[PDB]
């Protein structure tokens, strides 16, 4: 009943059967005959002989007295890897995820061989939760450190979690059978009940239509729990501790849906918010009243169903300039659409806008490049009259705010006769200082119950302006 094993492809640690004819406490003498000629003097069963890759052996055993029918051979062997050992297991309770780190002792293992790690996670010694398999190679017999994490489906607070690990080493050039290592000694992480919250998780957020479980630690029996008028069966974890699985979570209200666990005397609970990420900002356009600042207005799409301290946030970043601007919003006192302001940079005249949107569930973006000039929108004129030199027609003078000393206009002036006709004419004027302007007409009918009206334009092509206060100051008719 002999047997040979090995943990390094280098040495074979054999151990034969019991005694045939001699009693207990006998010494032994074994020899190994292949090509060499070395013998041994043993006191037990094991022998630990050098490993023979390709080649046969000839093993002679003697009982050391009252002899011995002991003769056998050796070719392959049986490969049992050195039981791995967990380096350090830790948790991030906020995200309720596990961190494992161990070191394959590749260093004490010769050839580049492939290895199979198997990680196992139990929630209570018994129940099995995740089962991982990664495959790789014993890196040039160097100790290589491995990392593995997992975000539990249940909060790490309301149940103990053990984690073991073992491996399989397949060496392409080994002939013996290759068995699995032992399971790494157990490494567990349990939370010490030390808080106010007994219900997990607190005030989380999830994509509507997802699945989620809720913890509840306690020392007094839990009678029942419900989401919203719902009453979920109780999953019985370990000391009158309870869990509840929830499926296809539905859109929460402005205030997150509630989850209450209830006991004999008291009641506990948390809240949950199910919404959507933000929609890609639709209809992103940036115009300009004056060539000083830009107005990028946009409209959000689907309502995130998340508001308040988790209302979707917007940020306008400029490509080259690098300047940005994160608009903070009131708690929805805006209506549907909203905009933001971006001060023009001197000597730019082209902006590569990208409106960013953030949300505790997702992010979106809509970018729009522009020639600020081609996108100008003048504000309506102000405070103008109708006076001139003595004769002929009238010389108008209008006031329009901003900075346009650089370009020209196409302010079309409409002249309306005595409640009948209205021909059209336009005179071009350059940009002046932050002040009024001075135009001109030609040969107009003195009085004749005439009326005026004005609307502008720009050298660049875009929106016109709001009409101004309609005036009808008839100069002199009889003298
Ligand atoms: C304003 O528009 C520009 C467009 O101009 C750029 O277009 C890109 C595609 C490239 O040819 C670049 O040379 C032009 O200037 C937006 O450009 C964004 O550029 C970044 C570069 O970091 C792109 O991301 C990159 O993507 C590659 C592979 O996809 C990665 O390897 C890089 O690491 C990097 O992540 C990005 O796709 C471009 N944006 C989009 C979505 O078009 C620019 O983003 C925008 N203004 C800003 C700053 O937001
Ligand atoms: C998740 O639920 C929806 C339907 O939700 C409904 O409205 C809720 C507010 C609540 O009152 C629920 O009880 C209601 O049932 C499921 O939608 C159906 O999905 C099937 C396919 O799965 C589809 O054929 C039907 O047309 C859908 N019905 C409609 C219009 O809602 C959805 O299936 C559930 N989640 C999953 C993945 O099964
Ligand atoms: C490797 O070597 C020994 C040598 O005895 C193996 O024993 C042989 O096993 C095979 C398969 O069972 C048989 O066909 C042979 O008859 C056995 N002996 C001979 C002739 O060599 C042993 O099973 C192998 N593995 C171990 C445990 O080392
Ligand atoms: C930004 O837009 C303006 C308007 O298109 C550009 O200025 C014009 O440039 C063209 C050359 O293609 C000239 O013919 C026009 O006379 C210019 N407009 C006027 C009258 O001011 C400007 O070049 C654009 N920015 C850049 C450099 O791409």
From Swiss-Prot:
Disulfide bonds join 4-14, 31-39, 158-215, 286-296, 411-456. Residues 1-479 are extracellular. Glycans are attached at residues 13, 34, 76, 88, 136, 188, 248, 335, 352, 371, 390, 426, 434. A motif (WSXWS motif) lies at residues 464-468. Residues 1-83, 280-379, 380-479 form the Fibronectin type-III domain. It comes from the Eukaryota. The WSXWS motif appears to be necessary for proper protein folding and thereby efficient intracellular transport and cell-surface receptor binding. Belongs to the type I cytokine receptor family. Type 2 subfamily. It is linked to Stuve-Wiedemann syndrome 1: A form of Stuve-Wiedemann syndrome, an autosomal recessive disease characterized by bowing of tubular bones and other skeletal and craniofacial abnormalities, respiratory distress, feeding difficulties, and hyperthermic episodes. Most patients do not survive past infancy. Signal-transducing molecule. May have a common pathway with IL6ST. The soluble form inhibits the biological activity of LIF by blocking its binding to receptors on target cells. Heterodimer composed of LIFR and IL6ST. The heterodimer formed by LIFR and IL6ST interacts with the complex formed by CNTF and CNTFR. This is Leukemia inhibitory factor receptor. It comes from Homo sapiens. The gene is LIFR.
């Amino acid at each position: 009943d002999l047997k040979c094993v090995t943990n390094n492809l280098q040495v074979w640690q054999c151990s034969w059967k019991a005694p045939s004819g001699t009693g207990r406490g006998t010494d032994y003498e074994v020899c190994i005959e292949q090509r060499s000629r070395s013998c041994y003097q043993l006191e037990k069963t094991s022998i630990k002989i050098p490993a023979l890759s390709h080649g046969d052996y000839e093993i002679t055993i003697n009982s050391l007295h009252d002899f011995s029918k002991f003769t056998l051979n050796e070719q392959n062997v049986s490969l049992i890897p050195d039981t791995p050992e967990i380096l350090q297991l830790s948790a991030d309770f906020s995200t309720s995820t596990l961190y494992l780190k161990w070191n394959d002792r590749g260093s004490v293992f010769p050839h580049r061989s492939n290895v199979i790690w198997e990680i196992k996670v139990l929630r209570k010694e018994s129940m099995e939760l995740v089962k991982l398999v990664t495959h790789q190679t014993t890196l040039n017999g160097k100790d290589t450190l491995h990392h593995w994490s997992w975000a539990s489906d249940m909060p790490l607070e309301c149940a103990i979690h053990f984690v073991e690990i073992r491996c399989y080493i397949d060496n392409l050039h080994f002939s013996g059978l290759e068995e699995w290592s032992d399971w790494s000694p157990v490494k567990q992480i349990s939370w010490i009940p030390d808080s106010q919250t007994k219900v997990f998780p607190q005030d989380k957020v999830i994509l509507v239509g997802s699945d989620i479980t809720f913890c509840c630690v306690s020392q007094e029996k839990v009678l029942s729990a419900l989401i919203g008028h719902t009453n979920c069966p109780l999953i019985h974890l370990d000391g009158e501790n309870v869990a509840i699985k929830i499926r296809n979570i539905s859109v929460s209200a402005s205030s997150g849906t509630n989850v209450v666990f209830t006991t004999e005397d008291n009641i506990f609970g948390t809240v949950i918010f199910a919404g959507y990420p933000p929609d890609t900002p639709q209809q992103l356009n940036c115009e300009t009243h004056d060539l000083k600042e830009i107005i990028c207005s946009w409209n959000p799409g689907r309502v995130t169903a998340l508001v308040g301290p988790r209302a979707t946030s917007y940020t306008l970043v400029e490509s080259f300039s690098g300047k940005y601007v994160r608009l903070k919003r009131a708690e929805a006192p805006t209506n549907e659409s909203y905009q933001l302001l971006f001060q023009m940079l001197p000597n730019q005249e082209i902006y590569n806008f990208t409106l960013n949107a953030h949300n505790p569930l997702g992010r979106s973006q809509s970018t729009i490049l522009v020639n600020i000039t081609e996108k100008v929108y003048p504000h309506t004129p102000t405070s103008f009259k109708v006076k001139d030199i003595n004769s002929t027609a009238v010389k108008l003078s209008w006031h329009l705010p901003g900075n346009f000393a650089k370009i020209n206009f196409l302010c079309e002036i409409e002249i309306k006769k005595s409640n009948s006709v209205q021909e059209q004419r336009n005179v071009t004027i350059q940009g002046v200082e932050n002040s009024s302007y001075l135009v001109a007409l030609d040969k107009l009918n003195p009085y004749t119950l005439y009326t005026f009206r004005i609307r502008c334009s720009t050298e660049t092509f875009w929106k016109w302006s709001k009409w101004s206060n309609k005036k009808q100051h008839l100069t002199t008719e009889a003298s």
